[PDB]
């Protein structure tokens, strides 16, 4: 209900009916020197995944966080 959204990267009240936080992770060109591009946010369904995408979905508040 109150999870973290990537672009502003702040605790953004998740919208009505949406109570998830997808930590979508996948590798791009610079995955070699940077690491998996991280993506947090809100959802009502654990989002779908692509061959290289990996996603951990919280259900509590502010538990969609990013490693240091």
């Amino acid at each position, epitope marked *: 209900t109150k999870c973290y959204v*990537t*672009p*502003d*990267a*702040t605790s953004q009240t998740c919208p009505d009916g949406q109570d998830i936080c997808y930590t979508k*992770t996948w590798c791009d*060109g*610079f995955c070699s020197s*940077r*690491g*998996k*591009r*991280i*993506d*947090l946010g809100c959802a009502a369904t654990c989002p779908k995944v692509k061959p290289g995408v990996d996603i951990k979905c919280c259900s509590t508040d502010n538990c969609n966080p*990013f*490693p240091t």
Partner: antibody
Amino acid sequence: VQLVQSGAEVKKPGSSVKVSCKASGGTFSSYAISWVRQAPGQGLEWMGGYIPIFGTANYAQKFQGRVTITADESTSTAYMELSSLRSEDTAVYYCARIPLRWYESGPYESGVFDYWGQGTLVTVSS
Amino acid sequence: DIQMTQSPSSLSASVGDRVTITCRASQSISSYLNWYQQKPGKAPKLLIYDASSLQSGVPSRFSGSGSGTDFTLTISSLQPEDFATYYCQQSYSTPYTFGQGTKLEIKR
């Protein structure tokens, strides 16, 4: 998101210019403000960029030591100050928001300028 | 610095035409190439990002394609609004580099 820059400026050789770039409608911190000068009937040249979150400014080798980029979250205004102005510095100066992509290591810049400001022309002549 | 060279320096064409603009990179920049449009007296505007992605509110006529060093911009149905200098700017290295620009004229 809109960027509103300073007015035109006529400056003399050796003088120094400071150009305002005011961001509006968008998160100033989660974004990055770069600068790119366009000489008359010439192409666009990246001068540098400032990510407020990090407070550090990444300047091009050319303009290293003459360009000083600053940001004031309070006024959400960004500033580019070029010193030792030469005639060849006569050009339109643009300020552009650069989205930031979040990798595992840290927030990194995505070299896409989503928003560009009304240019500011600095005319350097004696 | 990564050197980027748009090949169609000038390309005259009619509104009933389809135009493709070339940009070549000195280094493999992969999918990191943005496309912009600058009309006279106006600031650049981003047409395509990440090689093929199209920003919100950009005429679908604008399509972008390529990877590595060679990239292409397809304007599809030329409209008078779509006649201007177009620029290719890599996003791969800190020294962000732009192409010389290609000016779209009206074949008359």
